[PDB]
Amino acid sequence: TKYPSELIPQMDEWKILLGDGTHKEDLVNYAKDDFFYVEHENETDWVVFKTPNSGITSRTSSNTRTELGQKKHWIPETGGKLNATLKVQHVSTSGDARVAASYSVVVGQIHSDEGHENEPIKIFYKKFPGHTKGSVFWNYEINTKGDNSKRWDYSTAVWGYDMSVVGPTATSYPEEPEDGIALGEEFSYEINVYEGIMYLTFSSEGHKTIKFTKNLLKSNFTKKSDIPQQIKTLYASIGRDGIERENAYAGEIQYFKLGAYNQTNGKSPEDNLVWSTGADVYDGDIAKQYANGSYAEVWFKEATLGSGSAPE
Amino acid sequence: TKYPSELIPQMDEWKILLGDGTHKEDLVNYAKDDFFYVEHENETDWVVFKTPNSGITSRTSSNTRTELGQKKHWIPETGGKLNATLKVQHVSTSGDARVAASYSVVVGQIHSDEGHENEPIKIFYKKFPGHTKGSVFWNYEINTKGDNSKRWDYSTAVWGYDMSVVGPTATSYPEEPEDGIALGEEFSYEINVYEGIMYLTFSSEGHKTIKFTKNLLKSNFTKKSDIPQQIKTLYASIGRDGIERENAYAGEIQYFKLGAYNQTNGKSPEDNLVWSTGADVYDGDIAKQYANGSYAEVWFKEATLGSGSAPE
Numbered sequence: 001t002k003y004p005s006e007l008i009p010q011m012d013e014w015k016i017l018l019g020d021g022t023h024k025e026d027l028v029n030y031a032k033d034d035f036f037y038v039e040h041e042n043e044t045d046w047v048v049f050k051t052p053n054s055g056i057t058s059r060t061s062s063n064t065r066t067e068l069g070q071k072k073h074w075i076p077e078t079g080g081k082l083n084a085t086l087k088v089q090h091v092s093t094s095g096d097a098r099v100a101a102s103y104s105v106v107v108g109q110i111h112s113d114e115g116h117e118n119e120p121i122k123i124f125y126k127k128f129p130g131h132t133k134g135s136v137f138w139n140y141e142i143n144t145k146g147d148n149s150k151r152w153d154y155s156t157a158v159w160g161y162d163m164s165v166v167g168p169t170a171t172s173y174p175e176e177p178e179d180g181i182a183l184g185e186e187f188s189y190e191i192n193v194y195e196g197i198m199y200l201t202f203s204s205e206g207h208k209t210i211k212f213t214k215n216l217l218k219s220n221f222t223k224k225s226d227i228p229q230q231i232k233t234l235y236a237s238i239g240r241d242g243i244e245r246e247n248a249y250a251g252e253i254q255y256f257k258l259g260a261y262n263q264t265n266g267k268s269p270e271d272n273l274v275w276s277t278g279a280d281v282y283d284g285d286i287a288k289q290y291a292n293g294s295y296a297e298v299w300f301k302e303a304t305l306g307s308g309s310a311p312e
Numbered sequence: 313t314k315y316p317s318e319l320i321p322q323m324d325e326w327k328i329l330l331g332d333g334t335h336k337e338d339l340v341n342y343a344k345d346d347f348f349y350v351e352h353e354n355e356t357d358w359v360v361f362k363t364p365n366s367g368i369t370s371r372t373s374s375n376t377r378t379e380l381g382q383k384k385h386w387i388p389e390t391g392g393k394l395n396a397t398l399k400v401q402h403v404s405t406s407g408d409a410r411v412a413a414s415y416s417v418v419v420g421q422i423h424s425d426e427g428h429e430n431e432p433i434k435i436f437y438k439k440f441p442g443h444t445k446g447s448v449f450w451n452y453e454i455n456t457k458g459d460n461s462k463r464w465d466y467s468t469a470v471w472g473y474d475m476s477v478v479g480p481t482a483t484s485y486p487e488e489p490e491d492g493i494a495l496g497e498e499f500s501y502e503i504n505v506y507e508g509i510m511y512l513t514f515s516s517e518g519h520k521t522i523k524f525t526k527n528l529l530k531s532n533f534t535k536k537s538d539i540p541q542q543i544k545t546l547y548a549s550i551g552r553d554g555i556e557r558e559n560a561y562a563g564e565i566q567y568f569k570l571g572a573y574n575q576t577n578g579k580s581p582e583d584n585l586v587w588s589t590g591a592d593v594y595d596g597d598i599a600k601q602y603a604n605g606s607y608a609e610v611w612f613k614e615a616t617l618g619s620g621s622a623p624e
């Protein structure tokens with residue numbers, strides 16, 4: 001009988017989009033069965049975000065989400081911090097293993113509200129079908145100088161693989177990552193942007209805590225000879241060779257998002273081998289996708305917003 | 313009670329500078345006698361800011377302040393809202409009455425953290441010696457295009473006079489304003505910056521609620537022919553003919569301040585008849601100033617920070 005707002009005291013600082021295209025700005029005492037609701041398990045309550053592979057998407061995306069967006073925006077220079085503790089309960093059980101996005105779900109992001117509307121960070125959990133352990137990795141998308149159709153993401157592994165580890169054919173998978181994270185296994189992230197520098201921390205009991213620093217005010221990617229080999233390789237059949245503006249996301253307004261942003265869709269892999277995953281979507285029927293594994297589902301027990309801080 | 317943080321639940325969102333030059337970042341359970349403390353009166357507790365006319369000033373100013381500064385900064389596009397209810401209990405009883413800033417105290421501001429470090433708004437209370445009623449007015453400072461030494465403030469009256477109404481000699485005063493606010497009389501302000509537009513609301517029991525709208529993204533002062541007449545009298549002595557850059561404070565990082573920023577100092581009126589007030593400051597001896605009326609003291613009942621909101 002609980003609402004998610006009973007578990008997240010800053011619920012009034014978020015709006016939501018659900019997998020069925022519902023937008024809701026006032027989330028105090030709000031739930032909707034099968035998308036955004038509370039689940040009780042032994043001694044903890046969790047906020048569930050559940051979304052199919054193909055529901056009603058936002059105008060900005062081909063992928064379906066049930067995900068919060070922070071109402072108060074900020075530029076990297078003034079900063080912001082998001083802390084989450086969560087477990088992924090389910091990712092799509094179908095999709096083409098040659099496509100980097102298949103079988104994954106983004107569980108936190110910074111999204112830009114203007115300009116190209118790209119993401120300085122998207123944190124993913126990806127698990128191939130049949131595997132016990134999945135991978136957590138995070139992607140930085142360039143704030144492309146000029147035409148955004150040449151953009152790309154650079155993916156960095158936390159536990160397990162990064163997004164570039166694909167199967168060599170549509171239904172054969174790499175071996176499971178030995179150091180990865182199971183469904184139902186708790187982990188935490190913090191995204192702390194202080195004075196334009198994004199400091200990430202990822203922790204999970206029994207695994208190494210892993211930290212990263214990425215300056216969001218000065219690009220590392222301002223010419224062709226700076227594009228990482230990972231981009232040349234993973235985007236080789238797409239054609240993406242953009243460069244990033246010199247000052248990256250300096251002064252660009254953005255905001256946090258958190259929940260289940262499903263990156264497995266039913267688009268044809270031939271149209272985009274990195275992001276169109278060709279999964280089973282049952283012609284958009286949400287109840288049939290839910291009955292056959294064609295969805296993602298992520299549970300959070302803590303989601304806190306605060307100000308950016310100097311790492312100690 | 314004793315700590316101002318028992319009255320202001322958001323005390324951890326502010327830092328302070330006191331009139332003796334003390335800076336303190338963590339204000340929970342913090343008070344300093346004679347500067348920042350709580351006074352109980354009839355059935356309400358108030359947070360008191362008290363400052364001499366000449367204490368230890370910030371590097372940025374010739375005036376002394378005991379004043380909060382908001383820790384988390386913002387640009388006008390993303391916005392912010394400050395609400396306060398207060399009463400002014402004392403302004404300096406000495407000063408050259410010809411000088412526009414004399415006998416006044418700023419009780420709320422937006423202050424820029426970069427660039428020229430100018431203020432999109434400072435809210436003043438000013439009361440000539442011996443008057444019962446003082447005036448509340450607010451100043452917008454241009455974000456000067458080019459050299460800031462040509463900057464100026466434009467003052468708009470709320471109740472009573474604006475800053476430009478001065479006495480005819482150093483020691484005599486204009487008539488009391490018909491509509492002003494007495495020492496000890498409560499009034500409220502709200503500075504609500506939503507999508508770059510500043511909406512002000514001022515209210516006090518038994519006076520008209522007054523509202524203003526000022527766009528902080530698009531200057532009304534881009535040509536010399538737009539400089540208001542007011543500036544031509546006040547600033548005649550001083551060389552201030554600047555114009556403002558076209559997009560005003562767009563993208564410039566700001567934050568709110570609230571407290572007692574005393575505008576009466578001991579500087580020579582013959583050097584600057586707008587800001588150099590020639591008051592008695594007893595060689596910077598704070599005790600002697602407090603004993604002889606050379607100070608400002610403002611009590612707040614409420615002080616809340618929030619997001620900017622669309623008016624309605």
Ligand code: NA
Nearest residue numbers: 074075386387
């Ligand atoms: Na901001």
